[PDB]
Amino acid sequence: VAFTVDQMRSLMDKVTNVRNMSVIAHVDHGKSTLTDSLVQRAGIISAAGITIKSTAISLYSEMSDEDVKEIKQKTDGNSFLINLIDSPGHVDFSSEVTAALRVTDGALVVVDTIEGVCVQTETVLRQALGERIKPVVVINKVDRALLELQVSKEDLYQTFARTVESVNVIVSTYADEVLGDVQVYPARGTVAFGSGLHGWAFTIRQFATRYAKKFGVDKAKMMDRLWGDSFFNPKTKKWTNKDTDAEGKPLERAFNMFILDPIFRLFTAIMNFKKDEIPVLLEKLEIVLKGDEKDLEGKALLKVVMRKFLPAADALLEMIVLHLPSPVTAQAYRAEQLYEGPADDANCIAIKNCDPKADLMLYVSKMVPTSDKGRFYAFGRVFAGTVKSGQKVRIQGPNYVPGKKDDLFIKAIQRVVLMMGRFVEPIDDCPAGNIIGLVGIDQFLLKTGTLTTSETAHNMKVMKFSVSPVVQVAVEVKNANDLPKLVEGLKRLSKSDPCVLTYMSESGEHIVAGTGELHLEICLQDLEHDHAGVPLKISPPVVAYRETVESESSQTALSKSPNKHNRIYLKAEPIDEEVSLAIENGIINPRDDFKARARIMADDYGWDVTDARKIWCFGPDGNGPNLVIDQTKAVQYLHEIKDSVVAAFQWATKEGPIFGEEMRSVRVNILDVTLHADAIHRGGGQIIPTMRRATYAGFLLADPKIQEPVFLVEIQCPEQAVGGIYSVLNKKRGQVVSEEQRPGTPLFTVKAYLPVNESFGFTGELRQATGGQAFPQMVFDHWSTLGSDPLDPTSKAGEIVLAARKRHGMKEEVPGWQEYYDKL
Amino acid sequence: REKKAEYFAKLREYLEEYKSLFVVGVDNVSSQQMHEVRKELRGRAVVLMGKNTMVRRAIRGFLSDLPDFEKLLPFVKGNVGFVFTNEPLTEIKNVIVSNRVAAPARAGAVAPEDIWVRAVNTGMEPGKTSFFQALGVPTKIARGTIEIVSDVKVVDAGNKVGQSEASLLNLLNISPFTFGLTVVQVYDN
Amino acid sequence: IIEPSLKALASKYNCDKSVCRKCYARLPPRATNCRKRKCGHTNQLRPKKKLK
Amino acid sequence: KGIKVTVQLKIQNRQAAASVVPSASSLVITALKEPPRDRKKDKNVKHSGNIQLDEIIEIARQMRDKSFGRTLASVTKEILGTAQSVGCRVDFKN
RNA sequence: UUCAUCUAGACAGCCGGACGGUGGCCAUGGAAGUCGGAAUCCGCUAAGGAGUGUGUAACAACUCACCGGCCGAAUGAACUA
Ligand SMILES: CO[C@H]1[C@@H](O)[C@H](O)[C@H](OC[C@@]23C[C@@H]4[C@H](C)CC[C@H]4[C@@]4(C=O)C[C@@H]2C[C@H](C(C)C)[C@@]34C(=O)O)O[C@@H]1C
Ligand SMILES: Nc1nc2c(ncn2[C@@H]2O[C@H](COP(=O)(O)OP(=O)(O)O)[C@@H](O)[C@H]2O)c(=O)[nH]1
Ligand SMILES: [Mg+2]
């Protein structure tokens, strides 16, 4: 059945009858199949493989007035709008997960009957509890349980018992004290059952209300007397809390006894064929056959049998409302994290009270794209306020902070849209708490963004992910003329996927990030065929290396001009990492006064304040950790050499001698210069060819080595599966900087340095080593020299250099100080 | 043959002077508790262990330090041993039949009685709760800690225990080989 | 789901074994020499690489 | 105090946190040694010791896990000697 | 052909002890008997190695030497051809 655009508007007004919940399911635990058994059933319509993307599918529910007679939360009426969001399966797609929770309060948790709660289900579970979201479970595939394993009555109940047990555990460890009772129990009718595939589902609560009749037993007592030690005596008719009686004979657990008993009898009489029990048990359960449904046999017959006994939506749509949150009570304890700034502000207080006409606070959680010629939409949650087709909005960029301008475009919305999973529909307005969309913001905002109207109101929370873009790859065009298409297409990609990320490299390569390899490829396919639309190329992301020495040159450097008139004498000595660090941190500035700078570089970093107040230049880029210290007091015309000197220096610091790569922590000490008198033999053309060759020779004597980047990964893994990770760092040199965490949460966070050339596919191995249980936070840490000679094609560093040359098509060997020395 | 021959001279020495002794059996011991009972009496009662070492003592009954070994020799069987004292029995006897109490379950060892357990939370956080899962024991969350749902009879009387079931039992503190080193034979002067 | 007690009775006749470093035969775990004559009944053995 | 081989049991009930120490092998060579073998040797590998110490160690084994069960004095000539590489007391131990 | 166990009570087997210092010297991201080099001590008995392997993130835990219940005469390690 359908509802007109204006009924949606009128229905959305009552935030008490606004159900905003998503999906907490493991890769293939049957969420899509089940969620779409609800569309085919009670799915709202507009007035008249792999889940690559998703949206919030909406459904209607006209509940029982006395069922809402026990709903604890502000709830007015029986006209409920169910704004259901479909969170992706598989891991990596934890970007859509984190973002689908930011635009909801409650969520529907799906679990497999026999595959219980695999790592992905507790991944989604820990993510829901870190968003303060309250959940509701549903054990699906009960058909593959009493068929693919033919499981028995008592055994099946226990199977579910354990499913419950394991979930409550992760729920209580990462639960909220500010919420109270969150772990849903089948004892409180907050965990249904069924088969989205077979088209059925049911709660204990459905039969508690259908058996209060034949017993005079209230529904609160019916379902209480169905879980645990709750038994019955079919010999005297006295429900006893003990499996046996006076004869010591075992009884059936109320649940396995009355409720589940029909089910097995149906299967065997239906599948195995027993027409003498099909029509018989038909009426005993009050099931009615009509037309062609009557003639059906086998597995076809059984599917339709439940479509008359416990149809899907029935107990499913029931619980969604019954116990799950609506903007109302939801935002009323969440508001704190939902707004990152004044939790006592007037805008944050309107959200926590939930005012539909208060200050407009709508956050686009994802720029939902479409075959709208490269243009998207602004899908997000309206915490408070009404979306007016042309309303002026404060596009507060996450960088931006109330007292600034930094990315803030206060413009108005062209058209507005109502979300229907894959259906694009143009609405008028939209009240607070409901999740809607708005076209036009796209050409102003970047990927995600907070929207306000009040300047006092700060920014809201921009996820947290924990997933983070770890993977990396280079993307070069397979045709240099269509490179312009790539630049633009790469921009669109960022906006599309929540945790996807494009960025330029130090090697020129356009490095692309993602979560997993599965993830990355899905992104690349949407990139080469759509976003850009030109044959690409994915190569390993080439690392940057800072050629460096480890001691002062074995002898003084001697380089003379090509006309021969002047020579330069000195020696290069590696600076403390923390001293070259001060250069790149903006403490030892290249724009400072040689005295002020030298006092803080000598008193703080222990140097000779003479050559420290004589620190000539920084390099390269003028801000580089390679400096030239002055120690020449005899050179008359030094002034006609300082300028031409930094010229040939800025050239070697930005292109070394080992294979033409930059350096780091190289303080070249100038001890002499055989100067002339006329700058005609002391011009750039004489001093530059000397200064360059001088630096080189001196370097190959100063004990070469090569510097490669070093990471800092913080893998969030459960203390029990921690063994495997320790060993993947053990295979790719992983010094564990530390290992902190929390007393009550097993999730042991682990810091550990990881060298860039040993993280090329690391995520996959880390994932295969401990299952996807571990979540790595790879954020490049510091620079660290290796331990092999650059002129050694057998040692670590040496092999690198040789491979690096053939790539740029350079001179094979590692040219030394003899090839850069000018002797008599 | 080194130790047995030199031990012959030692064994004979304490037996040659004293006129009070106790025949005590075990096997279900523990070096810790065993050597720690020698500490309760490191001057009142000395513990000496043996075997065929008292079988040469059948040939020792022959020697005749005092022919009254016609009331001691024939009780050679079990992980039994020496209890040297020259103070009154009744007094050291209250003592001896009191230092025997501690052994839990070697996960698979010989089980004896019906295991009836009460259903209340033991105050330990959810660490081994995955055990309870594929073990069949209804559990819930009562103030973060794991709460037992039934006075269930987990393990039966007289069977070969399993590592997973005696692990939870180890955190429930059930150690049933409890007893061990007490008495068998008594004799004075 | 295989009950660790039976996943021991299972390995007793599958993993709990010995392998001849020459013919690879699956001998008893305690065997000292390979019962096959292709390797002249060798004493060189190795426990059947326990799975993980 | 004690840096390495510091087995420290923590025994608390409803808020009241208790500091209880097993004063191990490493804790005794420091409760006896002054600052030259009580600090500044983290970048240093402290393997120096020969000097006689005395009966002060019968009571130093009174704080080390009392699970030995016989004579305090005699057990330490063994523990403090062939286990402690920074002290040889009366060279008879070994 | 040696070598040195054994009715005084072996080998093997089955019953169960296999402790303490001690998460020993450091070394440790982490090393408790089981990543690594140095110490390889006696307190006490029947014994328990600063420990023979399995295992742990390290523990746990399993399991050996040693040592005890029973059984009662060989028959075990090493080499020769
Ligand atoms: C938040 O996302 C972050 C993290 O994924 C991480 O910090 C990542 O590090 C990228 C690199 C950063 C290095 C320093 C800043 C100096 C050298 C740079 C690198 C060059 O080889 C090493 C790592 C890996 C990249 C190579 C492959 C070109 C780097 C780059 O940005 O070019 O950068 C992205 C933006
Ligand atoms: N036996 C059984 N199989 C199911 C059921 N629901 C889904 N499936 C299976 O799971 C697959 C679909 O999983 P999907 O719904 O894609 O998992 P999701 O992406 O996490 O929602 C199908 O190939 C089905 O065979 C069910 O109720 N019973
Ligand atoms: Mg799907």
Side-chain angles (χ1 to χ4, degrees):
Chain A
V1 63
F3 283 84
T4 43
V5 182
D6 300 296
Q7 283 184 304
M8 335 298 265
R9 185 57 185 82
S10 193
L11 244 57
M12 279 193 139
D13 195 277
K14 271 198 300 179
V15 289
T16 56
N17 287 199
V18 167
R19 278 311 180 289
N20 303 310
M21 47 102 83
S22 48
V23 166
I24 305 300
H26 188 308
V27 73
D28 283 296
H29 279 223
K31 75 78 199 297
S32 178
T33 63
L34 171 148
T35 65
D36 301 313
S37 178
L38 303 181
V39 166
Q40 167 276 313
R41 177 70 175 56
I44 277 179
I45 303 169
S46 56
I50 49 114
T51 249
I52 203 291
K53 304 165 188 305
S54 54
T55 306
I57 299 68
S58 298
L59 257 65
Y60 181 68
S61 187
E62 189 142 282
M63 296 280 76
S64 171
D65 306 297
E66 51 175 296
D67 295 2
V68 190
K69 193 180 189 178
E70 190 180 62
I71 298 176
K72 292 153 282 178
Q73 156 169 58
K74 182 189 297 177
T75 303
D76 236 53
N78 278 75
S79 323
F80 298 99
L81 164 71
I82 295 177
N83 217 298
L84 149 67
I85 312 175
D86 215 54
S87 189
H90 321 277
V91 191
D92 312 308
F93 291 42
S94 290
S95 311
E96 290 184 58
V97 179
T98 306
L101 311 179
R102 177 110 292 136
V103 296
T104 32
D105 310 289
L108 179 66
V109 198
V110 196
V111 300
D112 191 310
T113 301
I114 30 86
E115 303 200 65
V117 287
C118 307
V119 34
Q120 239 288 283
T121 265
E122 42 206 57
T123 300
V124 196
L125 197 66
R126 165 189 305 90
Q127 292 200 298
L129 302 182
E131 235 276 311
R132 288 179 182 285
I133 287 185
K134 189 193 164 179
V136 150
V137 190
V138 162
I139 323 182
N140 176 47
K141 301 194 176 189
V142 168
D143 61 286
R144 83 168 291 164
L146 300 185
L147 181 58
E148 293 198 56
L149 289 77
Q150 320 169 298
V151 175
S152 300
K153 275 108 295 173
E154 191 50 73
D155 314 341
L156 191 59
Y157 160 71
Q158 286 280 308
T159 282
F160 300 162
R162 312 154 196 173
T163 309
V164 185
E165 298 169 52
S166 69
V167 192
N168 305 326
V169 154
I170 296 303
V171 179
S172 53
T173 288
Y174 306 95
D176 305 72
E177 299 168 298
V178 209
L179 277 66
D181 195 45
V182 69
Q183 316 99 302
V184 284
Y185 291 13
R188 274 129 211 190
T190 46
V191 177
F193 309 100
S195 169
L197 214 79
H198 282 43
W200 63 280
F202 78 102
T203 44
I204 42 288
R205 186 179 199 297
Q206 189 172 300
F207 301 136
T209 301
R210 200 195 297 188
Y211 294 55
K213 301 185 180 175
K214 306 191 166 187
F215 283 106
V217 178
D218 44 86
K219 75 184 164 195
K221 186 61 196 171
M222 245 296 289
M223 59 187 99
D224 250 324
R225 255 171 150 184
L226 289 169
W227 204 271
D229 267 346
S230 297
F231 266 96
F232 174 56
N233 208 292
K235 315 194 171 186
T236 59
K237 314 311 169 185
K238 301 174 171 171
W239 308 48
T240 171
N241 286 193
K242 188 161 62 182
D243 31 71
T244 68
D245 62 314
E247 305 181 68
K249 278 187 174 183
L251 314 156
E252 209 116 64
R253 195 162 310 203
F255 188 29
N256 306 292
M257 185 193 277
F258 308 116
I259 297 173
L260 304 184
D261 219 45
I263 310 160
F264 306 80
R265 297 178 284 187
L266 320 181
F267 272 31
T268 317
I270 296 166
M271 303 275 287
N272 305 48
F273 288 134
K274 288 186 179 181
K275 73 152 194 172
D276 266 299
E277 299 189 62
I278 318 170
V280 170
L281 283 48
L282 184 72
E283 303 170 291
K284 289 189 179 177
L285 297 172
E286 296 165 298
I287 307 305
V288 305
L289 282 184
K290 51 178 164 294
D292 305 290
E293 300 184 293
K294 298 191 178 179
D295 313 310
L296 274 173
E297 284 169 56
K299 318 78 166 187
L301 161 55
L302 239 168
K303 289 253 176 174
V304 196
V305 137
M306 308 280 128
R307 303 181 188 300
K308 308 171 190 229
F309 181 29
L310 341 161
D314 278 57
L316 298 184
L317 322 165
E318 198 177 58
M319 297 190 309
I320 305 171
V321 185
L322 298 210
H323 312 284
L324 276 176
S326 70
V328 177
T329 288
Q331 299 196 287
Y333 56 67
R334 285 161 41 66
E336 298 180 290
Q337 295 190 305
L338 324 189
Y339 176 85
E340 291 295 288
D344 35 72
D345 187 55
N347 283 57
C348 185
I349 294 310
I351 311 295
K352 188 166 182 179
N353 285 313
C354 190
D355 277 291
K357 299 152 290 180
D359 275 288
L360 194 74
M361 297 304 273
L362 201 174
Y363 171 81
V364 185
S365 211
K366 51 194 276 184
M367 286 218 260
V368 45
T370 36
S371 57
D372 279 53
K373 298 305 165 179
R375 288 181 294 159
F376 326 83
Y377 282 105
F379 176 79
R381 176 179 195 176
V382 202
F383 307 103
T386 36
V387 67
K388 319 173 184 179
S389 302
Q391 166 171 41
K392 218 172 184 179
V393 213
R394 300 185 50 64
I395 293 176
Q396 291 194 306
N399 300 292
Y400 160 74
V401 187
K404 299 161 188 302
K405 298 180 178 177
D406 293 62
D407 280 292
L408 173 76
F409 317 109
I410 306 75
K411 268 73 175 188
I413 307 143
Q414 300 192 77
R415 276 299 284 162
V416 178
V417 289
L418 217 184
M419 330 313 277
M420 300 304 257
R422 176 199 71 271
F423 256 46
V424 289
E425 203 52 63
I427 184 176
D428 301 291
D429 287 66
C430 171
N434 316 83
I435 292 68
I436 205 69
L438 49 156
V439 59
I441 315 300
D442 306 67
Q443 296 175 52
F444 300 139
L445 177 51
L446 190 286
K447 186 184 293 183
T448 51
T450 294
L451 248 42
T452 57
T453 230
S454 189
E455 195 168 1
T456 309
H458 283 62
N459 277 294
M460 306 157 186
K461 192 140 175 289
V462 275
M463 321 272 104
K464 63 96 184 188
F465 286 122
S466 181
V467 191
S468 295
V470 292
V471 186
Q472 357 73 284
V473 284
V475 188
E476 293 188 59
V477 303
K478 263 188 187 178
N479 210 290
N481 295 306
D482 295 302
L483 228 177
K485 270 193 168 190
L486 181 60
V487 197
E488 172 255 65
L490 290 170
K491 207 160 308 305
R492 285 188 172 154
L493 189 61
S494 317
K495 316 177 177 300
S496 183
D497 195 280
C499 208
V500 74
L501 148 64
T502 54
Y503 60 82
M504 198 166 311
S505 78
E506 199 71 287
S507 298
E509 297 195 305
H510 286 273
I511 300 310
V512 179
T515 302
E517 292 87 309
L518 187 192
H519 186 88
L520 197 68
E521 175 173 289
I522 306 306
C523 302
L524 307 167
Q525 282 186 286
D526 206 72
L527 166 59
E528 187 194 72
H529 314 41
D530 308 277
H531 282 307
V534 186
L536 299 183
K537 161 207 170 177
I538 304 295
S539 59
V542 180
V543 174
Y545 303 115
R546 295 294 168 292
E547 292 172 34
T548 179
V549 280
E550 216 298 287
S551 79
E552 189 191 67
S553 317
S554 49
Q555 80 192 299
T556 296
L558 137 71
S559 269
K560 66 184 312 180
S561 68
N563 183 39
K564 284 119 184 177
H565 228 295
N566 349 80
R567 286 172 144 182
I568 302 165
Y569 309 100
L570 62 68
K571 274 183 179 180
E573 55 164 282
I575 299 176
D576 188 283
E577 277 279 304
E578 211 269 68
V579 182
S580 281
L581 193 64
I583 286 164
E584 299 169 326
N585 297 324
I587 342 170
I588 292 189
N589 288 295
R591 310 282 169 284
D592 272 312
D593 151 61
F594 53 167
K595 174 182 182 293
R597 172 166 55 188
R599 299 270 81 151
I600 300 159
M601 169 223 308
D603 294 3
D604 300 60
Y605 305 88
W607 275 16
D608 179 32
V609 80
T610 261
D611 340 300
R613 281 176 101 297
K614 287 173 162 188
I615 62 150
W616 256 16
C617 40
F618 285 73
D621 289 296
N623 57 51
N626 301 53
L627 326 188
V628 166
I629 226 82
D630 186 59
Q631 293 185 298
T632 65
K633 355 145 190 184
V635 177
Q636 313 174 57
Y637 314 103
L638 153 136
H639 44 299
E640 293 184 297
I641 87 188
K642 180 182 183 174
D643 285 56
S644 348
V645 142
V646 181
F649 179 60
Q650 269 302 293
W651 194 23
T653 36
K654 199 72 178 169
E655 200 181 60
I658 304 179
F659 62 105
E661 248 257 60
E662 295 180 59
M663 321 152 102
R664 200 218 152 184
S665 300
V666 193
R667 176 197 174 195
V668 192
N669 290 200
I670 350 159
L671 313 174
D672 200 55
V673 167
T674 57
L675 254 218
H676 195 200
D678 40 77
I680 223 161
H681 297 320
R682 184 178 47 273
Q686 285 281 102
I687 289 184
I688 290 174
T690 302
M691 193 57 175
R692 158 155 252 65
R693 190 169 189 165
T695 292
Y696 285 180
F699 193 64
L700 296 324
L701 289 162
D703 263 78
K705 182 84 71 285
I706 98 91
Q707 240 186 69
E708 37 65 61
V710 179
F711 259 87
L712 183 54
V713 31
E714 295 132 64
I715 331 91
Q716 238 62 42
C717 70
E719 279 182 315
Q720 65 182 302
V722 169
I725 164 189
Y726 240 31
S727 79
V728 185
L729 285 279
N730 200 195
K731 182 182 274 62
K732 292 168 175 301
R733 296 171 283 120
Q735 320 131 195
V736 182
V737 198
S738 53
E739 214 174 306
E740 312 280 318
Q741 60 137 50
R742 297 146 263 57
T745 57
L747 186 80
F748 208 148
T749 169
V750 184
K751 280 184 172 51
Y753 276 118
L754 185 67
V756 286
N757 40 61
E758 287 187 300
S759 61
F760 286 137
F762 168 74
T763 343
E765 273 189 52
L766 171 65
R767 286 187 184 303
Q768 191 68 77
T770 51
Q773 279 241 270
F775 312 133
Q777 298 194 309
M778 301 210 275
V779 58
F780 163 67
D781 192 305
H782 82 312
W783 276 102
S784 192
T785 60
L786 199 284
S788 298
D789 193 79
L791 185 63
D792 247 64
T794 44
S795 70
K796 292 191 199 66
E799 304 166 300
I800 306 172
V801 168
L802 192 89
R805 284 187 163 296
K806 288 157 293 186
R807 277 195 47 264
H808 305 295
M810 305 172 154
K811 183 53 185 180
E812 313 168 1
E813 340 165 297
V814 204
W817 47 272
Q818 342 74 198
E819 314 299 294
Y820 284 126
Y821 219 57
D822 301 302
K823 189 189 175 180
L824 308 185
Chain B
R1 195 187 86 206
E2 308 129 353
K3 301 167 189 177
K4 316 76 172 173
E6 57 183 299
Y7 158 78
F8 281 155
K10 326 173 192 182
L11 81 93
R12 180 189 51 60
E13 196 249 61
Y14 324 75
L15 273 175
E16 238 230 22
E17 342 268 288
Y18 303 65
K19 31 276 164 174
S20 304
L21 201 148
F22 261 85
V23 146
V24 288
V26 79
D27 197 338
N28 48 49
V29 53
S30 165
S31 172
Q32 192 73 77
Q33 73 163 179
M34 171 55 164
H35 98 260
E36 275 179 343
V37 172
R38 287 129 176 291
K39 188 177 186 178
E40 331 283 357
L41 327 125
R42 266 295 122 195
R44 292 315 142 201
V46 163
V47 195
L48 251 58
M49 288 301 303
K51 30 118 79 294
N52 307 300
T53 32
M54 310 311 166
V55 169
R56 192 290 318 174
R57 216 273 270 204
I59 315 160
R60 150 68 158 186
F62 157 74
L63 204 164
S64 183
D65 191 60
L66 216 82
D68 248 279
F69 314 138
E70 302 175 349
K71 203 291 173 195
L72 288 152
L73 184 160
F75 297 78
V76 178
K77 248 155 270 283
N79 281 204
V80 174
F82 279 152
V83 159
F84 282 121
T85 202
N86 65 311
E87 249 218 10
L89 182 154
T90 44
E91 257 47 61
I92 66 77
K93 167 64 175 225
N94 207 54
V95 178
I96 64 176
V97 214
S98 266
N99 299 307
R100 33 61 150 173
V101 294
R106 207 165 205 172
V110 187
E113 11 94 348
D114 190 290
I115 296 300
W116 136 65
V117 56
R118 305 184 173 203
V120 207
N121 94 59
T122 34
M124 68 171 79
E125 295 178 64
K128 317 293 182 194
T129 317
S130 37
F131 271 164
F132 273 127
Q133 253 178 271
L135 171 60
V137 175
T139 287
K140 215 173 275 75
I141 293 298
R143 285 299 280 150
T145 61
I146 302 171
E147 191 176 57
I148 307 170
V149 175
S150 58
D151 301 72
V152 87
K153 322 294 176 181
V154 174
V155 39
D156 308 284
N159 272 289
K160 296 99 177 191
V161 179
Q163 202 96 182
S164 52
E165 51 148 297
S167 272
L168 83 112
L169 267 188
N170 226 29
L171 304 191
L172 307 194
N173 301 295
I174 300 83
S175 41
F177 299 162
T178 171
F179 202 58
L181 28 161
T182 329
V183 181
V184 187
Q185 199 242 73
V186 290
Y187 179 50
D188 284 283
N189 304 284
Chain C
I1 312 78
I2 326 170
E3 158 62 290
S5 77
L6 303 192
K7 195 183 73 287
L9 172 268
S11 295
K12 186 163 298 180
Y13 302 111
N14 291 68
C15 307
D16 196 292
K17 286 283 185 174
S18 180
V19 173
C20 169
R21 295 197 181 196
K22 293 174 180 186
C23 48
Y24 297 131
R26 180 194 316 178
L27 313 177
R30 302 177 56 263
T32 57
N33 312 73
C34 174
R35 69 172 84 81
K36 293 308 172 181
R37 69 180 298 191
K38 313 183 310 306
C39 58
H41 295 13
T42 189
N43 44 57
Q44 283 169 56
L45 296 177
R46 65 162 176 62
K48 184 177 180 63
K49 289 276 191 181
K50 297 290 305 309
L51 154 141
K52 64 181 176 186
Chain D
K1 281 187 190 179
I3 303 177
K4 68 291 150 187
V5 170
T6 298
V7 212
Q8 232 76 303
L9 177 64
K10 191 190 174 185
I11 50 166
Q12 156 248 157
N13 219 107
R14 212 58 198 86
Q15 179 120 62
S19 303
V20 89
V21 317
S23 282
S25 52
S26 303
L27 279 286
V28 164
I29 51 174
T30 63
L32 148 73
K33 269 302 172 294
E34 44 276 53
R37 241 301 322 191
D38 208 46
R39 192 66 233 99
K40 222 202 166 190
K41 290 198 187 287
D42 74 290
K43 153 178 265 61
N44 288 293
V45 279
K46 1 183 182 187
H47 270 283
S48 198
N50 213 56
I51 38 68
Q52 177 210 61
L53 313 160
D54 286 310
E55 308 181 297
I56 163 173
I57 290 77
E58 177 170 290
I59 19 175
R61 222 298 202 183
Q62 255 291 303
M63 279 281 100
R64 283 212 211 108
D65 263 307
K66 201 179 179 182
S67 314
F68 68 110
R70 335 279 194 169
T71 295
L72 321 88
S74 306
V75 181
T76 36
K77 186 192 306 242
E78 353 291 8
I79 327 181
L80 222 173
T82 59
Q84 330 295 132
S85 287
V86 272
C88 300
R89 199 178 318 183
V90 183
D91 302 347
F92 170 51
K93 297 82 207 84
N94 264 53

